[PDB]
Amino acid sequence: AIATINPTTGEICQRFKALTPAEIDAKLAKAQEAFQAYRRTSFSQRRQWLENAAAILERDTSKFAEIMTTEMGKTHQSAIAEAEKSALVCRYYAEHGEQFLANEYTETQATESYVCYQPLGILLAVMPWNFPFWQVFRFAAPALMAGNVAVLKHASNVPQCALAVEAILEAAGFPEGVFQTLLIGASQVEQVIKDPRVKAATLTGSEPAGASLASLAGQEIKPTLLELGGSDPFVVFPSADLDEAVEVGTVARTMNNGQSCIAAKRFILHEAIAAEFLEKLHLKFASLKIGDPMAPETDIGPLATEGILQDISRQVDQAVAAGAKILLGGRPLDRAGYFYPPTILTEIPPGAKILQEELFAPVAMVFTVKDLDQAIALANDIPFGLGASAWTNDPAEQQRFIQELDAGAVFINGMVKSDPRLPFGGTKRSGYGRELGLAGIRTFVNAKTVWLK
Amino acid sequence: AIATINPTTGEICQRFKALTPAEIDAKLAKAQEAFQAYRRTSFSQRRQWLENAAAILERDTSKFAEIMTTEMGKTHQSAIAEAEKSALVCRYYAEHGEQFLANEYTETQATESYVCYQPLGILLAVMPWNFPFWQVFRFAAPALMAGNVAVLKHASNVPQCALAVEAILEAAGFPEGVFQTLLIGASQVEQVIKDPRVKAATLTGSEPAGASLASLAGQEIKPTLLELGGSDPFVVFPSADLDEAVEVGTVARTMNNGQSCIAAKRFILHEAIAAEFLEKLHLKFASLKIGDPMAPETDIGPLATEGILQDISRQVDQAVAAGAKILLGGRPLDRAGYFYPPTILTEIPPGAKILQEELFAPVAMVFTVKDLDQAIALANDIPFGLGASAWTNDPAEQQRFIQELDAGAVFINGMVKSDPRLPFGGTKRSGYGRELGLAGIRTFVNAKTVWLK
Ligand SMILES: NC(=O)C1=CN([C@@H]2O[C@H](COP(=O)(O)OP(=O)(O)OC[C@H]3O[C@@H](n4cnc5c(N)ncnc54)[C@H](OP(=O)(O)O)[C@@H]3O)[C@@H](O)[C@H]2O)C=CC1
Numbered sequence: 001a002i003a004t005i006n007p008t009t010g011e012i013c014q015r016f017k018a019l020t021p022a023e024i025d026a027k028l029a030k031a032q033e034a035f036q037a038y039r040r041t042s043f044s045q046r047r048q049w050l051e052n053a054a055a056i057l058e059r060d061t062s063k064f065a066e067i068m069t070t071e072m073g074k075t076h077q078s079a080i081a082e083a084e085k086s087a088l089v090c091r092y093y094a095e096h097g098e099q100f101l102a103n104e105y106t107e108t109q110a111t112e113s114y115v116c117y118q119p120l121g122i123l124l125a126v127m128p129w130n131f132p133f134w135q136v137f138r139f140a141a142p143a144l145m146a147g148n149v150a151v152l153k154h155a156s157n158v159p160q161c162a163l164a165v166e167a168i169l170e171a172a173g174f175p176e177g178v179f180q181t182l183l184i185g186a187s188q189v190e191q192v193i194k195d196p197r198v199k200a201a202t203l204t205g206s207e208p209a210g211a212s213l214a215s216l217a218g219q220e221i222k223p224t225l226l227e228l229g230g231s232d233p234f235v236v237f238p239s240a241d242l243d244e245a246v247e248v249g250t251v252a253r254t255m256n257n258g259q260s261c262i263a264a265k266r267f268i269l270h271e272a273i274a275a276e277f278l279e280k281l282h283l284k285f286a287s288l289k290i291g292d293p294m295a296p297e298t299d300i301g302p303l304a305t306e307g308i309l310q311d312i313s314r315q316v317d318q319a320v321a322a323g324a325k326i327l328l329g330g331r332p333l334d335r336a337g338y339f340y341p342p343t344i345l346t347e348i349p350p351g352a353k354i355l356q357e358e359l360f361a362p363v364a365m366v367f368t369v370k371d372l373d374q375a376i377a378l379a380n381d382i383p384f385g386l387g388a389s390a391w392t393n394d395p396a397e398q399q400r401f402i403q404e405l406d407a408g409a410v411f412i413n414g415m416v417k418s419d420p421r422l423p424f425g426g427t428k429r430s431g432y433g434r435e436l437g438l439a440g441i442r443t444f445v446n447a448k449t450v451w452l453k
Numbered sequence: 454a455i456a457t458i459n460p461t462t463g464e465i466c467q468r469f470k471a472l473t474p475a476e477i478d479a480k481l482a483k484a485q486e487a488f489q490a491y492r493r494t495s496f497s498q499r500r501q502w503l504e505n506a507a508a509i510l511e512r513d514t515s516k517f518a519e520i521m522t523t524e525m526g527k528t529h530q531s532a533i534a535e536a537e538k539s540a541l542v543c544r545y546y547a548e549h550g551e552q553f554l555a556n557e558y559t560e561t562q563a564t565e566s567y568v569c570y571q572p573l574g575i576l577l578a579v580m581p582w583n584f585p586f587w588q589v590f591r592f593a594a595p596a597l598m599a600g601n602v603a604v605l606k607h608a609s610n611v612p613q614c615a616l617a618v619e620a621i622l623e624a625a626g627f628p629e630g631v632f633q634t635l636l637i638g639a640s641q642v643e644q645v646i647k648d649p650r651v652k653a654a655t656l657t658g659s660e661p662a663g664a665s666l667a668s669l670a671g672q673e674i675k676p677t678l679l680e681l682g683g684s685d686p687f688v689v690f691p692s693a694d695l696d697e698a699v700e701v702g703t704v705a706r707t708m709n710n711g712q713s714c715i716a717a718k719r720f721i722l723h724e725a726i727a728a729e730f731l732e733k734l735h736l737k738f739a740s741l742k743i744g745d746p747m748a749p750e751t752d753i754g755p756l757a758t759e760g761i762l763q764d765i766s767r768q769v770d771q772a773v774a775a776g777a778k779i780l781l782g783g784r785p786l787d788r789a790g791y792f793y794p795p796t797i798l799t800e801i802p803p804g805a806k807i808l809q810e811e812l813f814a815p816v817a818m819v820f821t822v823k824d825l826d827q828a829i830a831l832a833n834d835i836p837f838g839l840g841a842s843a844w845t846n847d848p849a850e851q852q853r854f855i856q857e858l859d860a861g862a863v864f865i866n867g868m869v870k871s872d873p874r875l876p877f878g879g880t881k882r883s884g885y886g887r888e889l890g891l892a893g894i895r896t897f898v899n900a901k902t903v904w905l906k
């Protein structure tokens with residue numbers, strides 16, 4: 001159901017009525033009318049409204065963070081960072097969007113020949129609960145700067161976040177119908193994708209959700225962008241700064257209570273450093289503070305939902321039954337709220353299903369390898385291909401990791417992070433298309449070739 | 454069935470056995486092995502092989518053209534041009550591909566941060582009979598320059614063309630498995646899209662074919678590019694060079710026996726010049742030479758298949774029964790082969806079904822409008838959105854047409870043409886994604902973000 005259920009206490013706080021198909025239709029009609037006027041606005045107006053939205057996010061950061069924490073359990077401090085990052089991407093496209101969409105001229109026999117960039121129309125965004133502000137602003141800032149309008153189907157467990165994003169954009173000055181939150185369930189999305197006024201769609205979330213949306217959009221001849229999770233490797237080689245790698249690796253696995261597409265999920269350790277690294281990782285994980293995410297000292301809040309908790313509990317239980325060893329954690333906490341402790345699994349047997357799954361919780365799989373070829377093969381031995389992190393100060397190793405890791409992003413001597421300045425997206429079953437950077441504003445526009453005699 | 458059936462005579466010339474699923478699987482296994490080595494080739498090698506392919510096309514142009522004309526009925530002269538254009542796109546990506554794929558650096562706190570471009574792997578291309586060389590080389594040249602490998606499912610009526618393309622690429626030096634023609638039917642494509650080694654797919658053709666491929670690819674989380682039909686407007690306003698517009702419009706509608714996605718299909722005439730333009734168009738169409746496409750004097754050969762002939766015959770018959778008037782032509786010729794004459798329809802009743810359909814034959818629909826707003830509204834009143842041509846020497850009108858015509862390409866005072874130097878693709882039900890230019894080589898690559906501390 002569409003509801004705020006606080007994952008720290010399990011309390012149902014507020015329920016929301018889903019829109020009916022007629023109500024969805026009315027919102028799409030309004031979006032179409034809004035688009036016809038909005039496509040004619042100047043970049044100066046769009047820039048003003050985007051910068052206003054950034055300023056709202058920058059002023060009321062703590063309030064917005066409290067909504068996120070209440071609904072989905074990420075620490076209030078990380079939710080503050082998320083609101084700040086949302087403001088950053090608004091400012092990024094305010095500052096660069098017009099330039100990024102300017103005519104590009106190519107010399108031909110024409111007096112004038114160029115490509116110009118024009119909005120498609122209504123874009124559908126289907127978004128997940130894990131970064132309930134950032135994922136939305138990541139899409140919405142370039143969408144709106146480009147002159148598109150947007151309808152958001154957010155996750156059913158973050159309705160207050162979804163409503164707050166629309167309220168921010170209204171307060172910023174964006175005209176009515178330019179951005180609309182649809183309080184609707186997963187079964188209601190098909191109507192939106194099939195509506196002739198809706199021109200494109202993006203989804204961030206699970207593979208089954210992405211497959212459903214993309215198959216439907218494909219049938220309707222509509223372009224998509226998908227970002228669908230990962231099982232990113234975190235490779236540590238003998239020339240690495242081991243203490244930095246342990247600290248950063250701990251953050252990479254456990255940030256957002258582990259619920260990140262680009263969490264470090266599989267630690268691949270060269271045998272020369274594996275014992276030292278693993279012992280340090282074990283101790284670092286054991287010192288993490290688990291508790292109320294509203295408290296500034298908390299490292300690990302609850303998982304977002306009972307379902308996520310049930311999923312990881314089963315995944316771990318099955319791996320252990322198959323022969324995997326629990327170095328730390330491995331069982332849900334006996335307390336109120338959907339709490340699962342930082343966990344480290346080792347000696348996972350070959351062929352165990354968990355090797356191919358995404359662990360959306362603070363649960364690290366650990367492996368040892370003997371050389372560069374083995375590290376790369378293991379790193380790539382997954383259906384996903386989102387991010388990858390590798391730690392080494394040998395230039396030849398650095399170049400091989402960069403070249404041969406099958407991922408949309410490769411970070412050397414740092415954790416994978418998204419950044420408005422650089423494109424971001426997956427390969428393989430992690431999806432396709434790129435958000436952020438120039439790519440983010442070029443994805444859902446008509447690149448119109450113009451030739452004038 | 455997979456066969457050469459000469460559309461000039463109706464004679465079945467050669468039949469081909471379709472691959473079995475096991476044979477398809479073997480070809481995909483070989484493509485995967487080939488990709489593992491081919492992705493490691495230098496741009497110099499890829500460039501050499503692409504330039505070799507161009508040189509083969511440039512030398513044996515008449516022979517390749519004869520294959521096209523025999524299988525699908527386009528004039529030998531236009532097939533010569535098609536082989537030349539195929540060579541041109543090979544040279545374009547040989548000359549620019551490396552530059553187009555070079556690292557793009559972005560300043561951050563990283564010592565090094567950039568995007569690099571790497572091939573995805575096996576690409577499936579599903580191609581149509583209407584430009585049986587050019588459509589293939591348009592995709593294959595950038596695919597191969599980027600380090601991808603490709604499997605081609607060509608139309609069932611151009612098997613000799615399909616085999617010839619593979620033979621050209623073998624003779625050029627491309628390693629075995631880098632490009633493979635699959636002699637398979639439409640029902641066999643699902644196996645290819647669902648194969649885990651196949652990473653992306655492109656289709657040019659009809660909407661139902663595109664919807665099938667894209668829906669399947671979406672379910673498998675695989676990116677696509679679609680170029681489907683169009684019903685492109687050809688708008689003529691009072692300041693136009695009328696005689697040039699008539700000459701060029703006649704070519705635009707009747708080239709390739711009318712069977713082009715970017716044919717001028719709907720002539721939209723300002724009332725001030727409509728009588729003169731229509732009379733001149735009538736005269737030009739009336740004296741086009743219909744006959745054997747191997748003869749150098751022939752303008753119009755047969756349509757490619759009995760099915761295409763049946764389709765246009767029915768479309769025109771229904772429009773006329775509804776009240777449309779035949780100014781010229783309007784029924785299949787009484788002779789051997791799938792011949793349909795240049796045809797002009799006027800006074801088409803509002804709500805007539807034909808107004809929304811693609812006429813893939815040399816059949817012009819003609820309309821009269823009173824002003825700029827009416828021209829734009831009528832031009833856009835279709836499900837398609839591929840190309841658009843407008844004729845005016847008023848700068849304000851030119852800019853409004855460029856801005857407001859809902860198409861992937863807008864040509865002012867010339868006919869729409871694809872050109873390797875400029876991206877090419879549709880909007881609305883005409884598809885999405887861009888081939889040619891920079892876009893063509895960026896579509897099916899992993900844009901990998903790299904960050905080095
Ligand atoms: N890439 C990422 O960042 C994320 C990945 N995931 C992965 O997915 C797993 C399960 O999480 P879960 O919360 O169930 O993720 P979902 O994929 O179910 O949710 C993501 C979004 O998709 C919507 N959705 C779900 N099914 C469909 C459908 N058939 N058509 C249209 N929209 C749909 C959801 O709506 P509703 O809430 O109404 O069901 C939500 O808005 C996680 O453990 C993680 O592995 C999940 C979240 C973030």
Ligand SMILES: NC(=O)C1=CN([C@@H]2O[C@H](COP(=O)(O)OP(=O)(O)OC[C@H]3O[C@@H](n4cnc5c(N)ncnc54)[C@H](OP(=O)(O)O)[C@@H]3O)[C@@H](O)[C@H]2O)C=CC1
Pocket residue numbers: 579580581582583606607608609610637638639640642657658659660661662663665666680681682683713714761764811812813
């Ligand atoms: N955009 C363009 O340039 C073209 C558009 N068209 C439009 O389509 C109309 C019909 O022409 P037609 O020859 O039937 O075109 P199709 O769309 O049937 O054929 C195009 C290609 O798609 C293949 N194909 C067809 N159905 C499927 C499917 N379900 N899955 C995978 N591949 C498939 C065909 O294979 P096979 O031959 O084995 O069926 C062929 O290789 C034309 O009148 C024109 O309007 C057609 C050709 C060119």
